[PDB]
Amino acid sequence: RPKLSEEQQHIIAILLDAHHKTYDPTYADFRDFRPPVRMSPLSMLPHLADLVSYSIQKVIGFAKMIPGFRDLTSDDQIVLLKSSAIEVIMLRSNQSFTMDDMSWDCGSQDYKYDVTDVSKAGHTLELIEPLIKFQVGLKKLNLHEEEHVLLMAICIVSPDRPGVQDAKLVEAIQDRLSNTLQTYIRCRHPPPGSHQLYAKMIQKLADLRSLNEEHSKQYRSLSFQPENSMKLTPLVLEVFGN
Amino acid sequence: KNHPMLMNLLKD
Numbered sequence: 465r466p467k468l469s470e471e472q473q474h475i476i477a478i479l480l481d482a483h484h485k486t487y488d489p490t491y492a493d494f495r496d497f498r499p500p501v502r503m504s505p506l507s508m509l510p511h512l513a514d515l516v517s518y519s520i521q522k523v524i525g526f527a528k529m530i531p532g533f534r535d536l537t538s539d540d541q542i543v544l545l546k547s548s549a550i551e552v553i554m555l556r557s558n559q560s561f562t563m564d565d566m567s568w569d570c571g572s573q574d575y576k577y578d579v580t581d582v583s584k585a586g587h588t589l590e591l592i593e594p595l596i597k598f599q600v601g602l603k604k605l606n607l608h609e610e611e612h613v614l615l616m617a618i619c620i621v622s623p624d625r626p627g628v629q630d631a632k633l634v635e636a637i638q639d640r641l642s643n644t645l646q647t648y649i650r651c652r653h654p655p656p657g658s659h660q661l662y663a664k665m666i667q668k669l670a671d672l673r674s675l676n677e678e679h680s681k682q683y684r685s686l687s688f689q690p691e692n693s694m695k696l697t698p699l700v701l702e703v704f705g706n
Numbered sequence: 707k708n709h710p711m712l713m714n715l716l717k718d
């Protein structure tokens with residue numbers, strides 16, 4: 465007999481608010497970035513570098529508010545954020561993603577990004593095709609915001625990230641969120657949408673590992689020429705590698 | 707490893 469405990473309800477309220485304080489659905493800060501350029505060679509890079517750097521900041525802001533995250537060592541906090549950042553960015557971006565034209569729509573035409581924009585940041589379909597497939601499959605899940613924020617937090621607190629020291633602690637924190645998500649689906653998510661919803665959500669986390677691996681490869685290739693590295697931000701270089 | 711900016715963004 466599954467029931468959402470007070471603690472579990474408390475976890476959901478906190479993650480919801482954490483997300484609200486770190487995702488601006490008005491996209492007002494986008495004016496601060498270097499301008500988008502579309503018409504050849506990496507013209508979207510300065511803009512998307514800035515957007516991604518901004519996004520890393522918001523993801524760290526979110527992770528800090530995850531119940532139990534603060535109990536980790538500073539080393540482990542660092543390991544979990546460096547390895548998950550790109551994945552949580554891909555997940556949180558689903559909120560602006562649209563199946564109409566398969567783009568990320570951040571308010572205006574200028575801040576509406578399609579596959580060619582992303583390729584003009586230095587990416588190929590080796591990444592972008594699985595990325596679009598991911599965004600589509602996620603949108604079709606029609607997650608409750610409660611589920612979305614839980615998935616992001618579960619993604620962050622993963623015990624098998626390379627370099628984790630206190631794996632047992634990382635697992636104990638994630639387990640509490642996993643249990644919270646599973647109970648939420650049972651109690652608040654009605655059928656048919658609820659069918660296999662947990663397994664499908666975890667499947668999206670596997671898809672994210674593959675996307676992260678391919679992003680990293682294309683990033684190491686991009687960031688190879690110092691002229692391209694120059695166009696990134698200090699936070700991007702520090703978090704994604706130098 | 708040396709992550710001064712991430713470290714600072716994480717501090718309480």
Ligand SMILES: CC(C)(c1ccc(OC[C@@H](O)CO)cc1)c1ccc(OC[C@H](O)C(C)(C)C)cc1
Nearest residue numbers: 512513516519554556557558559560568585683
């Ligand atoms: C398309 C995508 C997923 C995206 C990322 C962040 C976005 O922000 C706001 C959304 O949250 C609003 O809902 C929108 C889209 C992206 C992914 C990787 C990128 O990487 C470029 C290079 O690899 C660098 C070198 C610039 C990091 C660029 C864009």
